[PDB]
Design a protein around this ligand. Sequence first.
Ligand SMILES: CC(C)=CCC/C(C)=C/CC/C(C)=C/CC/C(C)=C/CC/C(C)=C\CC/C(C)=C/CC/C(C)=C\CC/C(C)=C/CC/C(C)=C/CC/C(C)=C/CC/C(C)=C/COP(=O)(O)O
Ligand SMILES: [Cl-]
Ligand SMILES: [Cl-]
Length: 541
Amino acid sequence: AATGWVVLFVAVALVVWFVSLDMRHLVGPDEGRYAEISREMFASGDWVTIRYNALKYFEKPPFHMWVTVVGYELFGLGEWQARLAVALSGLLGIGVSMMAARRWFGARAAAFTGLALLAAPMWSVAAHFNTLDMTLAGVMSCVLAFMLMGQHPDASVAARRGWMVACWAAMGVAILTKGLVGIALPGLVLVVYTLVTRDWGLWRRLHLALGVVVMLVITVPWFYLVSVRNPEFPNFFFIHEHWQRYTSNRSGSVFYFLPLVIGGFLPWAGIFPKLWTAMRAPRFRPALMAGIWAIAIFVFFSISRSKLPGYIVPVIPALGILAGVALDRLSPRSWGKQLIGMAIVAACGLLASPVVATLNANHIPNSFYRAYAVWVAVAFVVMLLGIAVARLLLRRGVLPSVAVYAMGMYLGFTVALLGHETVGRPASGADIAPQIAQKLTPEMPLYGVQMLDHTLPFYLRHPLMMVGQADELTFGATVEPQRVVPDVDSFTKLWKNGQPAMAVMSPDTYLALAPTLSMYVVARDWRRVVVANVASLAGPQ
Ligand SMILES: CC(C)=CCC/C(C)=C/CC/C(C)=C/CC/C(C)=C/CC/C(C)=C\CC/C(C)=C/CC/C(C)=C\CC/C(C)=C/CC/C(C)=C/CC/C(C)=C/CC/C(C)=C/COP(=O)(O)O
Ligand SMILES: [Cl-]
Ligand SMILES: [Cl-]
């Protein structure tokens, strides 16, 4: 019965979902870093010791790199293979959240959750950005939604056991993805829920024994292996990456995530208060569980000393579920108010498009941002078209109007995402990679002279040899000093009478080494100067 409109929708949703992965180049630092770590883990076969540019990188656990390496084995190297983990994680969050919503609030509310998570710019945009935030958010989305599945009164005891074992295994994979936060956050949400509901017997329906066992038999192996092979791992990873990161100064104010939420859930901002109403009318209270999820995690990261915008992505799935509740209780006129208001907001975004033509960040010229403002404006135009067609279909019902609205928003923010290619392409250094690879060999060193390039070594398929300040590889540079040049003088002596090699540096570094070290330019970029010691690997000078 009119299912062809759904199927087509999903089709139009899925194609744009995957093609958008390969529409733009990798942008630093996260995408190039994790793509390169996955590349080295893929070429070396060592899936235990995480390495970045041949140095140890013990700042993250390796589930994301495992998924991406599988993507490299099945689909080769490339951009969409690097974004495949966060893509499948976004699809996972949408699907499993829709499953929980359908189990609890019905099929229509589940459809509204799918439209809400599909239109949310943080979920759709973050699902195409190669960073561990989206994968953690999808896995923890399986955590929350499985918790909602097992705690259903109409579910059998075997069903509750299955969903709870899958929940503990889910949060286990979560801590295997981004550390102890995948067990700390859901436990905190559970504590707050049991505090406001006074339902302590809830803890009896969790299967702590079997669940804890299933979690340990999946998280303990890698930590034990990388801890035995590298005794310095647990102190750094558990102390410096959690306690020093949360309790001590990526800083910011308390309200640092206040706009990032309102921005990350912009198309549904008009129903932000109604979401709270969903927590009033959810034994077990699911909508209150999702609200305590979003509020608990939001407060947890709002008081952290280290803040990055991707921290609060896990709150989007729960925030989506509540959305699917609110949109389900709306009359046609009530949605009309949303179409009007969001039409005004999108029109304001369209009038505010020329602002991008004034910015120049990360030492990127103003021309690329002048080209970016065009795609921003086109994006807001797509949003206005989707809102218009949604108003045209409002007479057909609230569900199809919300469907066209969410499709227009998703296409719009997708256009705004692909428009960033105009700025990311000159920064990715992919244009000079062919000119470099014509002379560079795998046996040749590529000295990163006081510069940690995240995107160039990937497109070159060639690690760096850190020279001077190694930045986030300093630890790896100190544990294994044989793979790193400590100061610049050793780089000079390795350059003059050393082996044939190339060097990536900043233009200022080139101007500093020019009066002393004789070097010939191999490739020049807006942020990179790539030189060689022998005059054979360059051209004319
Ligand atoms: C109810 C539902 C839905 C499901 C059911 C749930 C269920 C079954 C639950 C049953 C499970 C159960 C017995 C729960 C029992 C109840 C419970 C709370 C147990 C806790 C879990 C256990 C045992 C041990 C964990 C030990 C700790 C210290 C936990 C934290 C305790 C909490 C909460 C708040 C304290 C506040 C502080 C000072 C935290 C610092 C540590 C962290 C965590 C720092 C991360 C900050 C950060 C900034 C991280 C960024 C990561 C990162 C590397 C960013 C890098 O960023 P870039 O690289 O730059 O991108
Ligand atoms: Cl209203
Ligand atoms: Cl980009």
